[PDB]
Write a protein that holds these residues in place. Structure first.
Motif, PDB file in Angstrom:
ATOM      1  N   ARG A 510     -23.303  57.332 -45.386  1.00 57.04           N
ATOM      2  CA  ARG A 510     -22.505  56.967 -44.228  1.00 57.04           C
ATOM      3  C   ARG A 510     -21.939  55.609 -44.587  1.00 57.04           C
ATOM      4  NH1 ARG A 510     -26.028  53.407 -41.250  1.00 57.04           N
ATOM      5  NH2 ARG A 510     -28.196  53.685 -41.939  1.00 57.04           N
ATOM      6  N   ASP A 511     -21.072  55.068 -43.738  1.00 58.41           N
ATOM      7  CA  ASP A 511     -20.355  53.820 -44.008  1.00 58.41           C
ATOM      8  C   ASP A 511     -21.257  52.691 -44.505  1.00 58.41           C
ATOM      9  OD1 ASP A 511     -17.940  51.837 -43.325  1.00 58.41           O
ATOM     10  OD2 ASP A 511     -17.349  53.875 -42.747  1.00 58.41           O
ATOM     11  N   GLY A 512     -21.014  52.203 -45.721  1.00 57.47           N
ATOM     12  CA  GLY A 512     -21.781  51.100 -46.287  1.00 57.47           C
ATOM     13  C   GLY A 512     -23.134  51.483 -46.878  1.00 57.47           C
ATOM     14  N   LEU A 563     -20.140  69.964 -42.342  1.00 56.96           N
ATOM     15  CA  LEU A 563     -21.541  70.072 -41.948  1.00 56.96           C
ATOM     16  C   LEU A 563     -22.122  71.386 -42.453  1.00 56.96           C
ATOM     17  CD1 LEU A 563     -21.426  68.779 -38.244  1.00 56.96           C
ATOM     18  CD2 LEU A 563     -21.928  67.470 -40.316  1.00 56.96           C
ATOM     19  N   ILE A 564     -23.409  71.368 -42.792  1.00 59.73           N
ATOM     20  CA  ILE A 564     -24.145  72.585 -43.129  1.00 59.73           C
ATOM     21  C   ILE A 564     -25.366  72.646 -42.214  1.00 59.73           C
ATOM     22  CG2 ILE A 564     -25.439  73.821 -44.922  1.00 59.73           C
ATOM     23  CD1 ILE A 564     -23.780  72.499 -47.013  1.00 59.73           C
ATOM     24  N   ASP A 565     -25.548  73.762 -41.505  1.00 60.23           N
ATOM     25  CA  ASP A 565     -26.620  73.863 -40.505  1.00 60.23           C
ATOM     26  C   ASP A 565     -26.579  72.688 -39.519  1.00 60.23           C
ATOM     27  OD1 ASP A 565     -27.383  76.106 -41.957  1.00 60.23           O
ATOM     28  OD2 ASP A 565     -29.049  75.107 -42.975  1.00 60.23           O
ATOM     29  N   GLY A 566     -25.371  72.243 -39.184  1.00 62.74           N
ATOM     30  CA  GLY A 566     -25.194  71.165 -38.229  1.00 62.74           C
ATOM     31  C   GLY A 566     -25.485  69.774 -38.766  1.00 62.74           C
ATOM     32  N   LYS A 567     -25.672  69.642 -40.079  1.00 66.36           N
ATOM     33  CA  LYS A 567     -26.042  68.349 -40.666  1.00 66.36           C
ATOM     34  C   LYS A 567     -25.102  67.902 -41.783  1.00 66.36           C
ATOM     35  CE  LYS A 567     -30.839  68.477 -39.267  1.00 66.36           C
ATOM     36  NZ  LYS A 567     -30.643  69.863 -38.739  1.00 66.36           N
ATOM     37  N   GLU A 568     -25.077  66.596 -42.046  1.00 65.09           N
ATOM     38  CA  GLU A 568     -24.348  66.062 -43.198  1.00 65.09           C
ATOM     39  C   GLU A 568     -25.089  66.547 -44.439  1.00 65.09           C
ATOM     40  OE1 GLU A 568     -21.674  63.778 -43.116  1.00 65.09           O
ATOM     41  OE2 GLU A 568     -21.548  63.780 -40.922  1.00 65.09           O
ATOM     42  N   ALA A 569     -24.366  66.837 -45.520  1.00 64.62           N
ATOM     43  CA  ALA A 569     -25.002  67.452 -46.687  1.00 64.62           C
ATOM     44  C   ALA A 569     -24.646  66.726 -47.979  1.00 64.62           C
ATOM     45  CB  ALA A 569     -24.622  68.920 -46.789  1.00 64.62           C
ATOM     46  N   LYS A 593     -30.171  61.973 -39.839  1.00 64.75           N
ATOM     47  CA  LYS A 593     -29.442  60.800 -39.355  1.00 64.75           C
ATOM     48  C   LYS A 593     -30.356  59.668 -38.863  1.00 64.75           C
ATOM     49  CE  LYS A 593     -25.159  60.947 -40.195  1.00 64.75           C
ATOM     50  NZ  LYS A 593     -24.119  59.884 -40.355  1.00 64.75           N
ATOM     51  N   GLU A 594     -31.620  59.985 -38.588  1.00 58.46           N
ATOM     52  CA  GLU A 594     -32.557  58.990 -38.065  1.00 58.46           C
ATOM     53  C   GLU A 594     -33.067  58.005 -39.120  1.00 58.46           C
ATOM     54  OE1 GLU A 594     -35.297  61.894 -35.718  1.00 58.46           O
ATOM     55  OE2 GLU A 594     -34.725  60.337 -34.273  1.00 58.46           O
ATOM     56  N   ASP A 595     -33.212  58.459 -40.363  1.00 57.83           N
ATOM     57  CA  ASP A 595     -33.749  57.585 -41.406  1.00 57.83           C
ATOM     58  C   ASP A 595     -33.076  57.751 -42.771  1.00 57.83           C
ATOM     59  OD1 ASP A 595     -34.731  60.024 -42.163  1.00 57.83           O
ATOM     60  OD2 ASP A 595     -36.851  59.485 -41.994  1.00 57.83           O
TER      61      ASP A 595
END
Length: 658
Positions: A510-512, A563-569, A593-595
């Protein structure tokens, strides 16, 4: 001409099929061609596809066979005990097993030519061996042949080398068909070639693929065009590029991005025997390990590669010398003049060659292309060519003059024998490349260059920052530019492996936030993370669920846009094996996305676990398909050196992987 025999739909289920009555009395004359379309997605360790034998007691070594190994090797034996002939010709890594989980139809063409006394094998439109012998043995002149067999060789009445697979079509001809005729035989290939023997590079070997998708939709690829077999430097190697404007369906004729002229570009069949296979071009300069990125601001495409002076590679490069002199803040390339035992010269402003001993400029200048001029006149050297005509490797002057370059063996002024990094740029997305420029030293005067990580650089999505990973002893050294590649600074990241070949590739999670995946000495791929756009780096962690060998292999990695299965891949490409460079996989990881942890959820097998897979390049094509350009062989194995047309390209869809 027409076949003397043709059959098909043969299932080989560890039980041979006898075709003696169909074939044996049709064989005539001394030349034959076998054309066989076959599948083997679960082969035995060693199995015969086709056999002609004397099956009688006392003649167990009188037979002809076409065989394969579960390593993907293809070969023939041609044996006659009364004649005292026992020929065995083969090449590793010649076959496909499965593609998208389905068995691949391999198209094999074996030509036995009595006129030229040569046995030639093609698989999938690729010549894998061509062997000329002194005493020719026509395949049906084996004493007492009485069996023609599919899926085994009948020796003394018993089935040897039983095969598992299928022969969908087989034809035989009483003629040695021409290379021209071979090319007209229809193929069912799961792969394409971007670079290949006989193309514009005139290299017979290729290694170290890259891929990068440009903003125009063009997909660009770079590669080592390796002339002196598949050997790493020291050798002759140029960097070549090709691009596709149709989502990878077709590719342009290659051009060079970085090239030296001190040795001729020769297409050579490098010896593969145990006495000569380590023959290595020893007096040529070379480039090796390229990496590409696109700069959104300037629109430029940027390519870096390592540069090796004549006779130099990773193993003999001076580790304690950058090749530059630091004089009051700036770095100047050092030069040694013929006759001198030390380096008394530097290349200063405007390419002026300066005597450090007398602090006076000389009459010499170094131009744009690192060529030597004297009083503004170009100096030349005589080019070398290589041959094995004498039974060993010879490197000799060939009569042709080329510009004198400071990286050359014959140059009046020579650079420090160590490794450098150079960069070139393109303003037309790979249609042409600028003359290369050396990057400055990053680790001080008394340290050799870092080693470029082949593959892609990283263009941060929300800034103008460009990053190229490199490695050296004890660290990853990230090269960072915020001004379209005009100037670079380093960011060092310690790693806990001493002298690792820590080939590293990056994704922006993600950004940075950058995650770098890299090769280690532990059998596991490592990673580290930056949360400040490459300024600082975390400690090293390991990926579980993928195995590499102790020495490791380069890994490629991209962040998928959908997205794959609703997630970034993230998608990782690597061999997955403890036993060699084989079992290639694409591994799909879903980002939490949490960690920013990654769940490695899908493993896609590129081909069989036992078939070769080494360095690789992956990119998301503009249509969201995935392109993979990879070494389909074990590039570490000392048994699989000097194979042609094994760097291959495939197209996959995300649903194929999941």
């Amino acid at each position: 001409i027409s076949p003397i025999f043709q059959g098909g739909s043969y299932q080989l289920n560890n039980k041979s099929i006898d075709i003696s009555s169909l074939l044996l009395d049709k064989l005539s004359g001394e030349s034959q061609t076998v054309v066989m379309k076959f599948k083997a997605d679960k082969p035995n360790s060693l199995q015969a596809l086709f056999g002609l034998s004397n099956s009688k007691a006392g003649f167990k070594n009188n037979y002809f066979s076409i065989f394969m190994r579960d390593s993907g090797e293809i070969g023939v034996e041609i044996r006659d005990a009364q004649k005292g002939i026992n020929y065995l010709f083969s090449r590793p890594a010649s076959l496909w097993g499965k593609h998208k989980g389905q068995a691949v139809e391999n198209t094999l063409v074996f030509v036995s030519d009595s006129k030229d006394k040569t046995y030639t094998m093609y698989v999938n439109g690729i010549e894998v061996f061509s062997e000329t012998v002194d005493t020719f043995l026509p395949i049906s002149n084996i004493n007492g042949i009485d069996k023609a067999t599919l899926g085994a060789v009948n020796r003394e009445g018993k089935e040897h080398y039983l095969a598992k697979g299928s022969i969908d079509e087989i034809s035989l001809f009483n003629k040695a068909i021409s290379d021209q005729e071979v090319s007209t035989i229809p193929l069912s290939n799961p792969f394409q070639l971007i670079f290949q023997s006989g193309d514009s590079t005139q290299a017979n070997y290729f290694r170290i693929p890259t891929l990068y998708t440009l903003s125009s939709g063009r997909v660009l690829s770079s590669i080592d065009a390796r002339y002196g077999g598949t050997h790493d430097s020291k050798s002759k190697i140029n960097i070549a590029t090709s691009y596709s404007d149709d989502n990878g369906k077709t590719w342009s004729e290659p051009i060079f991005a970085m090239k030296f002229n001190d040795y001729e570009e020769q297409l050579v069949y490098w010896p593969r025997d145990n006495k000569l296979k380590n023959s290595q071009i020893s007096g040529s300069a070379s480039f090796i390990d390229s990496s590409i990125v696109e700069d959104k601001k300037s629109g430029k495409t940027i390519l870096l590669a390592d540069v090796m002076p004549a006779g130099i590679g990773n193993n003999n490069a001076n580790k304690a010398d950058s090749g530059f002199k630091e004089i009051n803040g700036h770095y100047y390339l050092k030069l040694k003049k013929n006759g001198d035992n030390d380096f008394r010269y530097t290349v200063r402003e405007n390419g002026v060659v300066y005597n450090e001993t007398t602090n006076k400029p000389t009459n010499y200048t170094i131009n744009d292309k690192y060529e030597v001029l004297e009083g503004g006149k170009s100096l030349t050297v005589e080019q070398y060519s290589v041959d094995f005509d004498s039974g060993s490797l010879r490197e000799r002057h060939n009569g042709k003059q080329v510009p004198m370059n400071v990286f050359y063996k014959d140059s009046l002024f020579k650079v420090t024998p160590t490794n450098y990094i150079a960069m070139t740029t393109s303003q037309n997305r790979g249609e042409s490349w600028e003359q290369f420029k050396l990057l400055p030293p990053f680790l001080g005067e008394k340290h050799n260059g870092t080693y470029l990580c082949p593959g892609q650089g990283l263009a941060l999505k929300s800034s103008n920052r460009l990053i190229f990973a490199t490695y050296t002893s004890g660290e990853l050294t990230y090269l960072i530019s915020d001004d379209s590649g005009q100037t670079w600074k380093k960011s060092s990241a310690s790693i806990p492996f001493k002298n690792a070949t820590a080939e590293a590739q990056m994704v922006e999670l993600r950004d940075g936030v950058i995650r770098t995946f890299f090769r280690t000495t532990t059998g596991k791929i490592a990673y580290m993370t930056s949360r400040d756009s490459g300024e600082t780096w975390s400690k090293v962690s390991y990926i579980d669920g993928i195995q590499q060998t102790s020495y490791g292999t380069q890994v490629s990695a991209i962040k998928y846009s959908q997205l794959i299965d609703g997630k970034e891949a993230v998608i990782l490409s690597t061999p997955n094996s403890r036993s060699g460079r084989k079992g290639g996989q694409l591994v799909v990881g879903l980002v939490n996305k949490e960690d920013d942890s990654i769940d490695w959820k899908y493993h896609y097998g590129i081909d069989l676990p036992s078939y070769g897979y080494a360095y690789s390049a992956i990119t998301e094509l503009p249509n969201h398909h995935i392109g993979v350009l990879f070494e389909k062989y074990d590039s570490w194995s000392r048994n699989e050196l000097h194979l042609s047309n094994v760097v291959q390209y495939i197209d996959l869809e995300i649903n194929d992987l999941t």
